[PDB]
């Protein structure tokens, strides 16, 4: 029920800078299933499905 | 109802106030112990976090007394004194924190490491660091053939 959690040290992943509260950083997928998903959206989507 | 820190050593039948475990390692005066636990004497809050535990065991003030105190817990009740102090010394060297060292005269190392353990605990309680996550894989080791 919450956005993706900060599992690294104030980072959702090591591709983002620290204390990043943007929509991309916490797991907003701005793509359709027909446009693909960029690798970080793929990982966050995996977490939700799990 | 002040917070009182204690340690659970291996092969000692009861919990033990940590300040005792510092006495039994030969750092007898109070200030020498707070040199090893509190790496900076300016933060008052951690000092009054440590005060209660430094009161809890004001009674035991010398290395051999604390070694008695520890070894009285342990193997079998009715045992001579010298065996009791040998027991406590054997524990605090061989069994407690081996990775720091099993050889003798590893007591300044052992005291610094135990002070580190307590420092980390006090930060966790004052909130200056986050509680360790269990499912972080940095903390885990895969155990191959």
């Amino acid at each position: 029920g919450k956005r993706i959690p900060f599992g690294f040290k104030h980072r959702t992943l090591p591709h983002f800078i620290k204390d990043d509260y943007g929509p991309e950083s916490r797991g907003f997928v701005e793509n359709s299933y027909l446009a693909g998903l960029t690798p970080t959206e793929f990982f966050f989507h995996a977490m939700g499905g799990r | 109802i002040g917070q009182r820190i204690v340690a659970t050593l291996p092969y000692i039948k009861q919990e033990v106030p940590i300040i005792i475990v510092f006495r039994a390692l030969g750092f007898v005066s109070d200030r020498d112990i707070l040199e090893h636990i509190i790496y900076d004497f300016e933060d008052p809050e951690m000092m009054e976090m440590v005060k209660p535990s430094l009161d809890e065991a004001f009674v035991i003030q010398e290395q051999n007394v604390a070694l008695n105190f520890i070894g009285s817990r342990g193997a079998k009740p009715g045992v001579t004194k010298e065996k009791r102090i040998k027991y406590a010394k054997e524990v605090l060297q061989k069994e407690m924190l081996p990775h720091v060292g099993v050889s003798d005269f590893c007591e300044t190392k052992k005291a610094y490491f135990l002070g580190y353990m307590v420092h980390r605990l006090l930060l966790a309680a004052l909130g200056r660091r986050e509680l360790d996550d269990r499912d972080h894989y940095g903390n885990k080791r895969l155990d191959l053939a």
């Binding site: 690294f8 040290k9 980072r11 090591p14 591709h15 800078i17 299933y33 027909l34 693909g36 998903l37 960029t38 690798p39 970080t40 793929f42 990982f43 989507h45 995996a46 939700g48 499905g49 799990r50 | 040199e35 090893h36 790496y39 900076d40 990775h99 720091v100 300044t108 190392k109 610094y112 490491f113 580190y116 660091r129 972080h136 894989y137 940095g138 080791r141 895969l142 155990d143 191959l144």
Partner: protein, 195 residues
């Protein structure tokens, strides 16, 4: 041993007044010394590792910075993966290397010569907490609003975050995730030639 040759100050030789500002140093969890200039020590050591010097490749090396510890691991069981190393804003992997690998079968310029030349680096789950990964060498390109602009590593390719059965799925990123998980589980029941 190398640390002793450097300006490490072993622990049984310190006045406890000094620890306040210095940086601690743990080698496999054992508080081994202290040091006064951390960053130079870290750069020295990472350089030594990058040269295949005394520090073997699989030696994780973290630097907690808010708290003042440096931690070095050599134990067994840690998991790690190779990444590309980044200069200021540029990979160290030039086309010299691609040229020499392309004839990997004549020059015997293998992968080992590629780690040996300070181009890839094994970074493990705990040292990742302190890197900044470019997903692809385009993140390096100076953007209109440079996102981070101080990257440390790159991914070799994003698609190597998948496994042996999930690497069969074609276009896995157009699928909903439980679909990919079932296919992973049904690709192990599929009659073929097993040997």
């Amino acid at each position: 041993e190398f640390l002793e040759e450097w300006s490490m100050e072993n622990l049984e030789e310190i006045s406890p007044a000094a620890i306040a500002d210095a940086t601690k140093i743990f080698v496999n969890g054992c508080w081994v010394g202290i040091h006064k200039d951390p960053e130079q020590l870290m750069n020295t050591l990472r350089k030594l590792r990058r040269q295949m010097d005394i520090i073997v490749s699989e030696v994780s090396m973290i630097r907690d910075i808010r708290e003042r510890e440096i931690r070095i691991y050599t134990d067994a069981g840690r998991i790690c993966r190779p990444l590309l190393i980044v200069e200021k804003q540029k990979l160290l992997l030039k086309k010299r290397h691609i040229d020499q690998l392309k004839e990997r079968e004549y020059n015997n310029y293998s992968w080992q010569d590629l780690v040996a030349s300070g181009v890839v680096e094994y970074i493990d789950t705990l040292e990742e907490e302190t890197v900044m990964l470019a997903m692809t060498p385009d993140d390096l390109q100076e953007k209109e609003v440079a996102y981070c602009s101080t990257y440390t590593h790159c991914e070799i390719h994003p698609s190597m975050i998948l496994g042996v059965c999930a690497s069969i799925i074609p276009f896995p990123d157009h699928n909903q995730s439980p679909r990919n998980t079932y296919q992973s589980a049904m690709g192990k029941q599929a009659m073929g030639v097993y040997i």
